[PDB]
Curated annotation (Swiss-Prot), chains A, B:
Annotated catalytic residues: H41 (for 3cl-pro activity), C145 (nucleophile)
Location relative to the cell: Host cytoplasm; Host Golgi apparatus; Host nucleus
Organism of origin: Severe acute respiratory syndrome coronavirus 2 (2019-nCoV)
Domain Peptidase C30: start-end pairs: 1-306
Positions of crosslink type Glycyl lysine isopeptide (Lys-Gly) (interchain with G-Cter in ubiquitin): K5, K90
Residues of the full protein shown: 3264 to 3569 of 7096
Function of the protein: Cleaves the C-terminus of replicase polyprotein at 11 sites. Recognizes substrates containing the core sequence [ILMVF]-Q-|-[SGACN]. Cleaves and inactivates human TRMT1, preventing tRNA guanine(26)-dimethylation of tRNAs. May cleave human NLRP1 in lung epithelial cells, thereby activating the NLRP1 inflammasome pathway. May cleave human GSDMD, triggering alternative GSDME-mediated epithelial cell death upon activation of the NLRP1 inflammasome, which may enhance the release interleukins 1B, 6, 16 and 18. Also able to bind an ADP-ribose-1''-phosphate (ADRP).
Protein name: 3C-like proteinase nsp5
Regulation: Inhibited by pyridone-containing alpha-ketoamides compounds 13a and 13b. In turn, alpha-ketoamide 13b (tert-butyl (1-((S)-1-(((S)-4-(benzylamino)-3,4-dioxo-1-((S)-2-oxopyrrolidin-3-yl)butan-2-yl)amino)-3-cyclopropyl-1-oxopropan-2-yl)-2-oxo-1,2-dihydropyridin-3-yl)carbamate) inhibits SARS-CoV-2 replication in human lung cells. Inhibited ex vivo by michael acceptor inhibitor N3. Inhibited ex vivo by compound 11a and 11b.
Segments in the Cytoplasmic topological domain: 1-306
């Protein structure tokens, strides 16, 4: 028992991280087979940021302008292309440590592990959720661009995030690995703000089930509620609407705990209206929304990876 | 910016995890050079747990009783010995993925990453602290024994924990890698309880500095306090005494933030006496004590590993 924010084991991704230097900018790249993926703003300079035309900027580059270092072995770039907001550097050596992998674009509310990196070297690993406003609340300093977020499925690494920038509230924005930003953000230095966020309701419910699985029950009640009247309460507390699809996703946890989904909704209602009154749940004094239902099942059942 | 509970990158340790089977028990082992380290209670059986004499139990074993599997390659045991509560299985193949490493016994209040494992396969990675009562609040199911905790220093893996059991409060107990339990616990099935825990004061202060570095300042004040009068307040709220050595350890964070250590103590005093009044710090509604001063500096300055 116990319940922690648990990241995926990072080894498969550590073997893919490289340093990409172009001009006065250094950031991280992702080396899979003979291609290095990195944010296209690596080709910007300190005076290009304002409103760059990356097509122009890229046609002015030569392969030899891109300095790619994999540890203490430097990689020759033999070609380059742009895909949305990611640069693909073709190198003359395939990464022998390339895992089985997929590129996936995730939905808000889904979670992933971030391998935070500087100069191609990993600093640490932690679990994030994609917020409803398409930002992540990460831990990123200068040099971290090109760090990736990922999930692991049995043996396969699903890459879903590459880091590009920090918004003025201190939250983070980036792309999928095909270079499409999450959210309305652009890799331009302009007025950009996160926008209003909401709590991921289905995740809070998953975490309440985690708590029950682990012996916290003080928040349960005999009441129930309908999905309608729950969502009426959710809206007032800035929670995402709970859908019938969410309810079905919470099915397995409901079976295992013997607590119908709509009964856990009634418990969440009372926690929203009354607060926790100095109680904690799973070591938290706040309702936690960065565990998906699958995260809970994985951790409370012991799934592993090969 | 941002601040997360960040684990060390786990790749170096993933390449050392193996499955150890003896009799009806399966658990994890740590394969470094030609030795596999695992909890000695692997040699117990379902009727041995009550009060086993492991010396007797071990002299009755043959090498071929230990089934060691490194993925889909099975390892022959060519010898076995006992060191305190860990079994050392000598195998005829050295692990080619052995990192540079140390065994270290940590002090309460120090943190480490846990690579949670089942059947020799990693499940997830997360950050723990050794509690003052020598337990850890982990996330461990049956089969997780032999999972290890570790820190990384530049390029070197310092192993500091191997998992053995869960106490009745749902917290976890284990040994250093030389087999000495942390705390008064024994690998015997008897009445064993964690004992009273306390909050790691120097860590709370580190985390308050993390908050300032990241733009939370609402808890600061103009007051100061003496180390004596702080510890008088600490005792009443079940906090560890703050030592002059703790104060000196918090020096770097004090410089960088311009906030004298004793002024941050005055801020912690008021948080203890008044609570947070519905405020949060770094996303938490509780005072967080599982970040050491070194953790804060590492994360807020961007240290990496090779
Ligand atoms: C890439 O390593 C870097 C990561 C940022 C720095 C601080 N936190 C992060 O996550 N990204 C940038 O610095 C980014 C660069 C621009 C270049 C032109 C196209 C759009 C991206 N700019 C950025 O994030 O500005 C905000 C910021 C806040 C605080 C410190 C800094 Cl250095 C930047
Ligand atoms: C080893 O994989 C296992 C890890 C425990 C199981 C549940 N959570 C854990 O951390 N350890 C044990 O099962 C341990 C075995 C004894 C054997 C005799 C010597 C001392 C250790 N016993 C144990 O932890 O009992 C408490 C417990 C609580 C809940 C479930 C279980 Cl299966 C055990």
């Amino acid at each position: 028992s116990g319940f922690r924010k648990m990241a995926f084991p990072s080894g498969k991704v550590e073997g893919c991280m490289v340093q990409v230097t172009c001009g006065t900018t250094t950031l991280n790249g992702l080396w899979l087979d003979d291609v290095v993926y990195c944010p296209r703003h690596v080709i910007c300079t300190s005076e290009d940021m304002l409103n760059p035309n990356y097509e122009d900027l890229l046609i002015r580059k030569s392969n030899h302008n891109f300095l790619v270092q994999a540890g203490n072995v430097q990689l020759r770039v033999i070609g380059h292309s742009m895909q949305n907001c990611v640069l693909k550097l073709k190198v003359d050596t395939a990464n022998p440590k390339t895992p089985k992998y997929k590129f996936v674009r995730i939905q808000p509310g889904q979670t992933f592990s971030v391998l935070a990196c500087y100069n191609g070297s990993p600093s640490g690993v932690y679990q994030c959720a994609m917020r409803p406003n398409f930002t992540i609340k990460g831990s990123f300093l200068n040099g971290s661009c090109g760090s990736v977020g990922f999930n692991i499925d049995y043996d396969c690494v699903s890459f879903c995030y590459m880091h590009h920038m920090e918004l003025p509230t201190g939250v983070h924005a980036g792309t999928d690995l095909e270079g499409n930003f999450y959210g309305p953000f652009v890799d331009r230095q302009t007025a950009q703000a996160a926008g209003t966020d909401t709590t991921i309701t289905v995740n809070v419910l998953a975490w309440l089930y985690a708590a029950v699985i682990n012996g916290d029950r003080w928040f349960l009640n005999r009441f129930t509620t309908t999905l309608n009247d729950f969502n009426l309460v959710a809206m007032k507390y800035n929670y995402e609407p709970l859908t019938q699809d969410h309810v079905d996703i919470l099915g397995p946890l409901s079976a295992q705990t013997g607590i119908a989904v709509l009964d856990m909704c009634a418990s969440l209602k009372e926690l929203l209206q009354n607060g926790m009154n100095g109680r904690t749940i799973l070591g938290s004094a706040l309702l936690e929304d960065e565990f998906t239902p699958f995260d809970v099942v994985r951790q409370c059942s012991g799934v592993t990876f090969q």
